[PDB]
Enzyme design. Structure first.
Site, PDB file in Angstrom:
ATOM      1  N   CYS A 163      -2.865   4.726 -11.432  1.00 14.42           N
ATOM      2  CA  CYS A 163      -2.426   3.988 -12.642  1.00 14.42           C
ATOM      3  C   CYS A 163      -3.574   3.995 -13.659  1.00 14.42           C
ATOM      4  O   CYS A 163      -4.736   3.920 -13.254  1.00 14.42           O
ATOM      5  CB  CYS A 163      -1.897   2.596 -12.309  1.00 14.42           C
ATOM      6  SG  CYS A 163      -0.439   2.660 -11.235  1.00 14.42           S
ATOM      7  N   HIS A 194      -0.936  -4.415 -15.501  1.00 10.16           N
ATOM      8  CA  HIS A 194      -0.645  -4.783 -14.089  1.00 10.16           C
ATOM      9  C   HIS A 194      -1.943  -4.717 -13.268  1.00 10.16           C
ATOM     10  O   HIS A 194      -1.919  -5.111 -12.084  1.00 10.16           O
ATOM     11  CB  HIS A 194       0.565  -4.004 -13.546  1.00 10.16           C
ATOM     12  CG  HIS A 194       0.301  -2.622 -13.053  1.00 10.16           C
ATOM     13  ND1 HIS A 194       1.012  -1.525 -13.518  1.00 10.16           N
ATOM     14  CD2 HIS A 194      -0.544  -2.150 -12.114  1.00 10.16           C
ATOM     15  CE1 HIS A 194       0.626  -0.446 -12.861  1.00 10.16           C
ATOM     16  NE2 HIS A 194      -0.337  -0.797 -12.016  1.00 10.16           N
ATOM     17  N   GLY A 205      -3.717   3.939  -6.940  1.00 13.32           N
ATOM     18  CA  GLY A 205      -5.018   4.022  -7.623  1.00 13.32           C
ATOM     19  C   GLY A 205      -4.985   4.946  -8.836  1.00 13.32           C
ATOM     20  O   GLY A 205      -6.004   4.943  -9.563  1.00 13.32           O
TER      21      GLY A 205
END
Ligand SMILES: CC(=O)NCc1ccc(S(N)(=O)=O)cc1
Ligand SMILES: CC(=O)NCc1ccc(S(N)(=O)=O)cc1
Lengths: 304, 304
Positions: free
Chosen positions: B145, B41, B143
């Site tokens: 991830c 993603h 942020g």
């Protein structure tokens, strides 16, 4: 979102841990520049610990009596000195992994990370607080002495704790990196009782702010209070008195959430008087006091 | 003595964290050998996340569209591929700090350490468990991830988790390092409800053993039970069924403490039926289920 008891990343400190052996005693040392810091009780036999005269025990010790191993490599000890309750072992090699660092003596209520070590090898990292009775509630087995507590500000490790002893009650006592014990404790195997383990009120308030921020708000009530009224309830419940300094420190959490500090005080007052009635806050059935206002801002903002 | 929620030392993993930027999205990557692993993603705009076709979005992306920064140094991307929900970015340089490592897919109830990172920089380390509903209860801001979960066996890092998403309920979902989600979750911004968050019974029993070992024994009762009788109470209280496999795993704690597993089951049964009545165990007012039997042995024995 979510709120976790979070330690600092430990790699900068892992880089500093060494094994110190004197005779048959092995414990952990902290290698910064060309000095290794360790508890002076490394020179004691388990007999010695009952009534040690450290100055007299140290006369019998030379540089070559201190065995310092960093990984599987021996460091050469070219000097030793005793500063309060720590030995400083001068080695002939500067730790190449020495981070930017300070030695800081923390106040009760201040939180730090512990890197629990055995034979100079890290086993684990946890967060804890200097209790108002200058104990810490750690996890330390035999061989963990010399394990250190620290905070990190960007790339600077502030070392605040070195582990020295477990009290008969199974709570922990240690020194700053100048070898001065937190509280009245001595590096002797005698009766040493901790005082009242009071709750760090400002830390509970910080954590209630963290809870509101993360959506846990059931405990927010209709009331306010005054610092004097709140403090009467605090005293009754063995909570530390709240000062205007604490109110000021909670200012940014107050601003973020739009909950005035004294209103949050009144919510905490009702939680003390009424209990949690089987409800949880941030997955705790009791009021957590091992987050500082700074910890809550850091974790809620994402500082690296 | 003392028992703490303890993470693995994080330095080996700190050594692997990089920043990945695709367009205007920045998140964390894991750099092992000459591959950087990150959530796929990273290629999505916040619009894309509502209904992403990852294969079609990826066609529009080249090697030079993935910006990989390790410290303040840019890595050259010489290849990219999508494996389930992760991107593998081949870089021209092997991570020189690559630890011995494995990729492992854990089972529900298994614990691991998270190194929470922002812009490829570690902020904190905490311990958590894969919940029986294949969520984790983490602390992750935007942020975070690509932040990873791991266990360490001596010098080998077993990576088991990469952070991908927060559900509308503020619990966390992610993948193993082959990009396969734990549970039924997808990397899409849609309604995704977690199932029942049941208590990890074997972990509670392990932690009650840890409590006995550390001197907290008030909850030990006069009773025993059977796996069938216990399991009736477990089901009523949303605890996971206890199997003979769990009993076998608790064998060493049983042996250390001389408390048969079924007697400890009967103690736990009375705690469920009677509550804690305002008493604590290892400083908790509720039953902790984020220590595995292995965690309790490790911490109570001092493995490095
Ligand atoms: C003598 C020299 O060239 N370097 C000193 C050194 C550096 C690191 C270690 S370490 N981190 O393996 O324990 C041990 C000794
Ligand atoms: C090209 C080379 O000679 N080495 C590669 C390298 C190693 C470490 C890092 S790092 N840990 O600073 O981000 C960045 C790049």
């Amino acid at each position: 979102s979510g709120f976790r008891k979070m330690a600092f990343p430990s790699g900068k400190v892992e880089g500093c841990m060494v094994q110190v052996t004197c005779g048959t005693t092995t414990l952990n040392g902290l290698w910064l520049d060309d000095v290794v810091y360790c508890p002076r009780h490394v020179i004691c036999t388990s007999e010695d610990m009952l009534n040690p005269n450290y100055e007299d025990l140290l006369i019998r010790k030379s540089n070559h009596n201190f065995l310092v191993q960093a990984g599987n490599v021996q460091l050469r000890v070219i000097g030793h000195s005793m500063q309060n309750c720590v030995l400083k072992l001068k080695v002939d090699t500067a730790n190449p992994k020495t981070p930017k660092y300070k030695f800081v003596r923390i106040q009760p209520g201040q939180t730090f990370s512990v890197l629990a070590c055995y034979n100079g090898s890290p086993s684990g990292v946890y967060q804890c607080a200097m209790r108002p009775n200058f104990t810490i509630k750690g996890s330390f087995l035999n061989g963990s002495c010399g394990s250190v507590g620290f905070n990190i500000d960007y790339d600077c490790v502030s070392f605040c704790y070195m582990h020295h002893m477990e009290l008969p009650t199974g709570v922990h006592a240690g020194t700053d990196l100048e070898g001065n014990f937190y509280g009245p404790f001595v590096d002797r195997q005698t009766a040493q009782a901790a005082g009242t383990d009071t709750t760090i009120t400002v830390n509970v308030l910080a954590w209630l702010y963290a809870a509101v921020i993360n959506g846990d708000r059931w405990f927010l009530n209709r009331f306010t209070t005054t610092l004097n009224d709140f403090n009467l309830v605090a005293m009754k419940y063995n909570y530390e008195p709240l000062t205007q300094d604490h109110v000021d420190i909670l200012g940014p959490l107050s601003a973020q959430t739009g909950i005035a500090v004294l209103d949050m005080c009144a919510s905490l007052k009702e939680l003390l008087q009424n209990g949690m009635n089987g409800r949880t806050i941030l997955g705790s059935a009791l009021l957590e006091d091992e987050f500082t206002p700074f910890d809550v801002v850091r974790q809620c903002s994402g500082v690296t």
